[PDB]
Write a protein that binds this ligand. Sequence first.
Ligand SMILES: [Ca+2]
Lengths: 223, 58
Amino acid sequence: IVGGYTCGANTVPYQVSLNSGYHFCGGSLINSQWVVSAAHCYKSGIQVRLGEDNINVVEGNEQFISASKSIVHPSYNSNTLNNDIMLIKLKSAASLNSRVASISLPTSCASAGTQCLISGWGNTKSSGTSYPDVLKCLKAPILSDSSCKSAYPGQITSNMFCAGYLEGGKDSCQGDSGGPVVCSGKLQGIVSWGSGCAQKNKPGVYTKVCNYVSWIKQTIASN
Amino acid sequence: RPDFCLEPPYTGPCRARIIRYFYNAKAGLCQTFVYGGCRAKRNNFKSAEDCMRTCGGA
Ligand SMILES: [Ca+2]
């Protein structure tokens, strides 16, 4: 039983590819001109790609829109990885349809146990290399803080959550950062970091989105 | 020239997929590797030209 599965074309309509010559991270469309991603995905020269499945062929559903602005969270900490959140303004608004859609911000935080969908075109081998062409998905439960903090002693902040399986084998990996953790319709996490990928006792670590909802709404509103 | 230049490429914990450069002394040239976005070490360059200039000939 392999962790990820091929989501299906345009079944995760709010997934974006961030591109700078190649796919370097993911992100989530939260309205027609804004993307939320990971602060460590900040680059110059992003083009956001929407309505992808195969990131290597032009299947017709695409909208490739450059960003005008990229706002990294004022308290992002490069070392501690705390507040690993960034907002990206499109040059122009996306045309929103069925294959291209946005994802609602949480109105409250998810509890441990809540099962989520993690998507992305990251590395599909725990140890190894293989970057898929099409979008992969993974359903993975939210982990308890207590367990999270045992997995990464002295490193988890209030702004972080662990999700996945203590067994390992099912995770998200390099290429996945910035991309969603959607739970019960709402956007709860951002793919952020981990020790390796899909290791035993080392779940993935995610930015706790429900902490920032105010900051996002406002920051969108005045930019 | 230096000694960070002999250290192996560090992807680190972050899950980006960013192509960078390191000095490979077993090849005698600067190579590409997958940098996960954070906590970079010094044998991590953003171009081959930089890499060659700091590390080249180590
Ligand atoms: Ca495509």
